[PDB]
């Protein structure tokens, strides 16, 4: 009987009006914890807000698109819970207009495009971003952050920020987006399908 505890905690996000922002939250415990998102007590209820569960509901991503300011700007709360106890954590969302963006704000110079690979073959999704500091690429598949460790060898981010998928499988198929992040904020590239034939 271990109380819930967070293993990936959400971080404050600075997003652009008309784009996407995602908060990732996951916990562990015994019995296994269930996480959920809410805003200021009441639970998240909008047509532009989505919660994508994972890790048997012990993990949840909150995704907002399109981002709207000032309405979306809030503090969002992830709650992890099991039979032993409860624990909550939060993250703030800030949404800027394009004209409000600092020069160092992440920018997708070249987003990912259509890809069709045959299974067991290597696919490579390209992405070039820029900003100040140089932004870190985070790959998303179907609104969930791609997890290299769970791929066991096959999937890695290369030095160029591109995602390499070795020995492709049917599960690899889906919508991929490139997320460029830094201290000034977060930018999402347009989605790009990967197909496995």
Q: Does residue 112 interact with Cl ion by CB under 5 A?
A: yes
Query: What's the closest the beta carbon of residue 183 comes to Cl ion, in angstroms?
Result: 27
Q: Does residue 126 interact with Cl ion by CB under 5 A?
A: yes
Q: Does residue 113 interact with Cl ion by CB under 5 A?
A: yes
> What are residue 175's DSSP bridge partners?
193
Q: Which stretch binds Cl ion (CB under 5 A): 30-38, 51-59, 97-105, 106-114?
A: 106-114
Sequence-ordered list of residues with C-beta below 8 angstroms from that of 98, at least 6 positions apart, any chain: 16, 17, 18
Q: Does residue 160 interact with Cl ion by CB under 5 A?
A: no
What single-letter DSSP state applies at residue 1?
-
Query: What's the closest the beta carbon of residue 166 comes to Cl ion, in angstroms?
Result: 9
Q: Which of 196, 19, 33, 159 is nearest to 97 (CA)?
A: 19
Q: Which stretch binds Cl ion (CB under 5 A): 23-31, 69-77, 110-118, 139-147?
A: 110-118
Residue 118 burial (C-beta neighbours within 10 Å; 0-12, 13-18, 19+): exposed
Count the site residues for Cl ion by CB under 5 A.
Answer: 6
Cα distance between residue 119 and residue 34, in whole Å: 34
Q: Which is nearer to Cl ion, 126 or 144 (CB)?
A: 126
Q: Which residues lie near Cl ion (CB under 5 A)? A: 112-113, 121-122, 125-126
């Amino acid at each position: 009987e271990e109380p819930p505890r967070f293993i990936k905690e959400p971080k404050d996000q600075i997003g652009v009006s008309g784009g996407v922002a995602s908060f990732v939250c996951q916990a562990t415990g015994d019995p296994k914890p269930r996480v959920t998102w809410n805003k200021k007590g009441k639970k998240v209820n909008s047509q532009r807000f989505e919660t994508i569960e994972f890790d048997e509901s012990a993990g949840a991503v909150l995704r907002i698109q399109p981002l709207r300011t000032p309405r979306d700007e809030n503090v969002y709360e992830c709650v992890a819970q099991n039979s032993v106890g409860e624990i909550t954590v939060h993250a703030k969302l800030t949404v800027l207009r394009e004209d409000q963006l600092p020069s160092g704000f992440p920018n997708i110079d070249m987003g990912p495009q259509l890809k069709v690979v045959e299974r067991t073959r290597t696919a490579t999704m390209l992405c070039a971003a820029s900003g100040n500091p140089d932004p870190e690429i985070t790959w998303f598949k179907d609104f969930l952050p791609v997890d290299p460790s769970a791929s066991n060898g096959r999937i890695k981010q290369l030095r160029s920020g591109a995602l390499q998928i070795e020995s492709s499988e049917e599960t690899d198929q889906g919508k991929y987006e490139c997320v460029a992040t830094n201290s000034a904020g977060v930018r999402y590239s347009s989605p790009a399908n990967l197909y496995v034939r």
